[PDB]
Design a protein around this nucleic acid. Sequence first.
RNA 1: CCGGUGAGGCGGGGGGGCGCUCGCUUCUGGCGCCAAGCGCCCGGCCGCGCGCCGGCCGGGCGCGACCCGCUCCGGGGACAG
Lengths: 119, 67, 241, 49
Amino acid sequence: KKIRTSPTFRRPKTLRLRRQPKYPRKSAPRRNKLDHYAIIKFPLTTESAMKKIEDNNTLVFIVDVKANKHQIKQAVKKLYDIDVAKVNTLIRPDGEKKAYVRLAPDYDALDVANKIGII
Amino acid sequence: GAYKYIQELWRKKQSDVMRFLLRVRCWQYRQLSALHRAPRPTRPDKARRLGYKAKQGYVIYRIRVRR
Amino acid sequence: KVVNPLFEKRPKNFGIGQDIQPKRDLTRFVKWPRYIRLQRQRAILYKRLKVPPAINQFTQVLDRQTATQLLKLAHKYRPETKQEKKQRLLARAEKKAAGKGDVPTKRPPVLRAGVNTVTTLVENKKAQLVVIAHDVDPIELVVFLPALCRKMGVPYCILKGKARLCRLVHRKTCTTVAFTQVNSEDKGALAKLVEAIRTNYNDRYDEIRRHWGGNVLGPKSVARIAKLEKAKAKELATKLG
Amino acid sequence: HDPGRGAPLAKVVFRDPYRFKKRTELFIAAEGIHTGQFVYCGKKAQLNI
RNA sequence: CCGGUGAGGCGGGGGGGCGCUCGCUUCUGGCGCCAAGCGCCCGGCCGCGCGCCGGCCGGGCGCGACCCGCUCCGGGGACAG
């Protein structure tokens, strides 16, 4: 005794189960190949880069194209034990990403450059 | 056995019974899609003679081809 | 007083151009799926078309009380299921050499399930009563069988539901069943069932052969033609007398 | 005005007596039909333009 | 085979009556849905206590909105194709 209110007959919602595989498709997860060491290739030591470092309290790095601003900021913080104010990324006409990492005013970009070795 | 009787029945296609059955089956099949999976054979005797076996793994598809 | 005067009536007039119609039943106007539509109009076609007697004979089904009696009688002769043949085999294995067991003893009479087996034993004239399901999807399986049983003098009856017939056996569906042998205790009941079945089926198989069935039009068309016939009867029904 | 058609069309709003909705139809405007006019459709409708 | 729709009231029957008739709407650029009324029951609390008694809170079903039917309504149709 269930009356049809509407003339249309939609497909009834049937129960659907989740995935319960008998065995994983892959034995182990693939190790991440975008770690903090792989993401950052090398800093730039050009005259413009040094002027940028000594004027705007920032740093210049070469990063893979696949990296995001969040990834670059986290990688810089993890590697150099520094706080990043912001990140500005661009792609040079060569295939390598250039990243201007503007640091927080508390830390000294020239001191960080001295520590990392570029001057 | 029933299979020989079924074979003779299918051989006597011009009879009224077989004519009615063929007409009803043709109408039902034409009312369906051009390729749908039949769950059981329409002609068990013909299926057995052609090699169909009533065991898992055997499938039967009914196909409508334009004349 | 326990009725607040603020309680009004506010009736709804469900007319044309008035308040909208209520949510009533619309099952007659549902756009049913193609398979439902096909399975309904197939039954409509079976009712409409002039069905040959060889297929129409299965519309003559067994009555409720006789069906219940036959099912009760066959309940004793239902075949052994799984986990029972295993028990019998293990019992015979343990009794092979435990108490001087030659294992020739006896096997009880059992029902016959397959159409091939039933046909073979009907042609051999070993059957005493054969039950045939009326709802086999391919009717080609059993059309000859009532005629063969009538020719061989084997009482045949038609039951409703291949599912019900195959529930006596331990499977899903079964087209035919046969009483090859029965116990002496149930011999009288089997004879009563046999005579009741042959009174209704075998003794009038000529009528069954000659009984075509069909030409049953839809109720709307029947009502229209009945109205036309009543009008033509009233044309000269009271004027002349 | 319907582009590519000489006759102007008329939008007429009815109320569907099955759901709480207002249906809209694009009739072909007969000569003399004006806005804010009631039009009646059906077997019992009066014989008016 | 063709048209319409969200395949929404198609065919019969007595229900209803101001008097065959309808599901009851035409002086106007307003509004109109997710039920009021009635009847039958259920769960928790409170007073009588004999509780299908009474009061409070929360719920179900039927009429309201007739019943039965085999093609959704129609237009062709043994012919177009």
